[PDB]
Amino acid sequence: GLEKIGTWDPASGLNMTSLIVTTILEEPYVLFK
Helix, strand or coil, X not given: CCCCCEEEECCCXXXXXXXXXXXXXXXXXXXXX
């Protein structure tokens, strides 16, 4: 039936109700040291 679903009021509007760096192994950008 008719149920309240939230309020309205003029101020409040309508109030309803270490970094893991993954990479690839690829020379020469990232090779295994």
